[PDB]
Ligand binder design. Sequence first.
Ligand SMILES: O=C(O)C[C@@H](Cc1ccccc1)C(=O)SCC(=O)c1ccccc1
Ligand code: NI
Length: 183
Amino acid sequence: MLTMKDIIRDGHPTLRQKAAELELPLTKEEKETLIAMREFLVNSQDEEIAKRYGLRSGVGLAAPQINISKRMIAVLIPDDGSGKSYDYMLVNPKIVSHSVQEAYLPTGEGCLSVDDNVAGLVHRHNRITIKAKDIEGNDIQLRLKGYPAIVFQHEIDHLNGVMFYDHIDKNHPLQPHTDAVEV
Ligand SMILES: O=C(O)C[C@@H](Cc1ccccc1)C(=O)SCC(=O)c1ccccc1
Ligand code: NI
């Protein structure tokens, strides 16, 4: 199983690479790492197993963060109120379309690869559409609004070597952009 000593840290140059597109079907090794990625999130969201392996809680993980410069991500966003959950393992994900309307988390964002908390808003597209491949090479099209949209944008950002904190306005970090929804 993956643990925190697998996650590489801010300053590591793999995080600033642009990750390569995978050929299909995937290799057994590639499937294993994507499955594990998911298992990490699951594990980090169990209070006992996180206690035991000192896992920080995660809802998203990009392969670059375990130092694998390939275009795959996992997302595991448990129910939390509404009856929507999000358990996706995606290969070569791509945002094909999005809203003009931006959204943001009022308390900013976090990143497993980052150890300081960093205050500042990260404006994102409130709605998105992603085309991707699943772990068996079948086709996925996701329509996402709100928190999931942000989460998946966060992880996609990782594949282009973009960190959430690059989106912070230097001089007015807590200033909402006009007409942006708070999530
Ligand atoms: O480090 C990562 O890339 C994963 C990260 C992504 C993230 C996206 C959008 C906003 C904040 C962070 C996290 O999953 S941080 C953990 C988290 O937000 C959480 C987990 C369980 C319960 C409540 C919150
Ligand atoms: Ni991150």
